[PDB]
Amino acid sequence: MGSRVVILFTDIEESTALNERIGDRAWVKLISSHDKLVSDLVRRQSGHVVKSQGDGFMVAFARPEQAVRCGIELQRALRRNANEIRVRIGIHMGRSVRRGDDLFGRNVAMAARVAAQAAGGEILVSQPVRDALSRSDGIRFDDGREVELKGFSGTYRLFAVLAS
Amino acid sequence: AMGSRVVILFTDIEESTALNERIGDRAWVKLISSHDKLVSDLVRRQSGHVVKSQGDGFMVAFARPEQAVRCGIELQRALRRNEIRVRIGIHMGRSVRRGDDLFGRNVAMAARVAAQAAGGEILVSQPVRDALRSDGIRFDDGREVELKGFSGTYRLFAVLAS
Ligand SMILES: Nc1ncnc2c1ncn2[C@@H]1O[C@H](COP(=O)(O)OP(=O)(O)OP(=O)(O)O)[C@@H](O)[C@H]1O
Ligand SMILES: Nc1ncnc2c1ncn2[C@@H]1O[C@H](COP(=O)(O)OP(=O)(O)OP(=O)(O)O)[C@@H](O)[C@H]1O
Ligand SMILES: [Ca+2]
Ligand SMILES: [Ca+2]
């Protein structure tokens, strides 16, 4: 059931506290700039922004390498800007159901929970994504760590992207 | 906080992920599609506007707090008639309304109020409570909670419906 897709979620770390610190005027400007940054970088990796959730985005890619490259570029850009906003990123792949400009299904929820596990500045991918990129020449992962994900049974191993 | 005054209602399904996993994607998509139509219908009856979806819930704008609360009351009633339990939180304040979206700290606050609600419950912030027996709505005495990202405590009031 559903078409196979790679889902990337972004979320800003402690965005509510940031918004409260800087005030709504500054926040709207910051989030507009951030939206444009994410949108541009997604487009470069032939991805599609499915939707935004205030301080985060759900993004779809056809290939896992595109999702990871996008995450890598986004973290790089955020580091460059910081000269502050930290973003966590999670990537998962599997079948999901399209409805309008949205995605539904357990693999959407799982991608979101993978992102929720990541620290600010970090890109985490699920084991299927790591395995699919086991033979990549430029993408490197740590040895992963075991977590449990809300709503799911059992344990999942999540892998951090190690960028050049 | 900047922008125009708006009433923001959030819904959220309790343990939707576990529910998805138990019944499967086929059944879940059918269920959430049905749920979406129900929420959209009830929102429109109280002159609200769905701003967006957040997977298993919605962000809704109303001009007046009585509209948002009546919507929540009808939604909870409807869900009982129909298992999915929904949390509902309502806040009001100034927000920036740009490109068919709402931005600002009062958006985040409304989300946090909804996250504090029990499944089956409608929680409102103090400003909503204060703005409303003249219009047929009753509340408990409130509970004081901390909300992630905000300093100090906030008194949240449950709607007591017939
Ligand atoms: N434009 C928007 N659309 C939808 N939701 C929004 C919007 N703006 C704010 N929100 C809400 O505000 C909240 C953003 O805060 P979030 O829950 O990510 O915690 P945070 O303060 O970033 O802390 P952390 O993510 O580090 O736990 C979300 O729950 C989201 O629903
Ligand atoms: N179609 C979708 N679009 C966007 N996000 C989705 C979608 N489906 C699932 N999600 C994500 O999965 C999340 C479910 O998270 P939530 O934190 O609400 O968990 P839950 O399983 O409902 O448990 P509880 O709400 O009781 O904590 C959604 O809020 C959203 O972040
Ligand atoms: Ca966040
Ligand atoms: Ca939920």
**Portion 108-147 of B in contact with A at CB < 8 A:** 108, 111-112
- The experimental resolution of this structure, in angstroms, equals 1.5
Method of determination used here: X-ray
Cβ contacts (< 8 Å) between A113 and chain B: which residues? 17
Q: Is the CB of B114 under 6 A from ligand 1?
A: no
By residue range, what is the domain housing residue A122? 1-164
Q: Cα–Cα distance between B135 and A158 in angstroms, integer? A: 52
CATH number at residue A99: 3.30.70.1230
Q: Which helix (H) or strand (E) holds A6?
A: strand A3-12
Q: Cα(B36) to centroid of ligand 4, in Å?
A: 14
Number of domains in chain A: 1
B52/A1 Cβ within 8 A: no
Q: Cα–Cα distance between A72 and A122 in angstroms, integer? A: 9
DSSP-assigned letter for residue A44 = H
Beta-ladder partners of A4:
A95
Rounded to an integer, what is the distance from CA A50 to the centroid of its chain?
12
* Three-class secondary structure assignment of A115-158: HHHCCCCCEEECHHHHHHCCCCCCCEECCCEEECCCCCCCCEEE
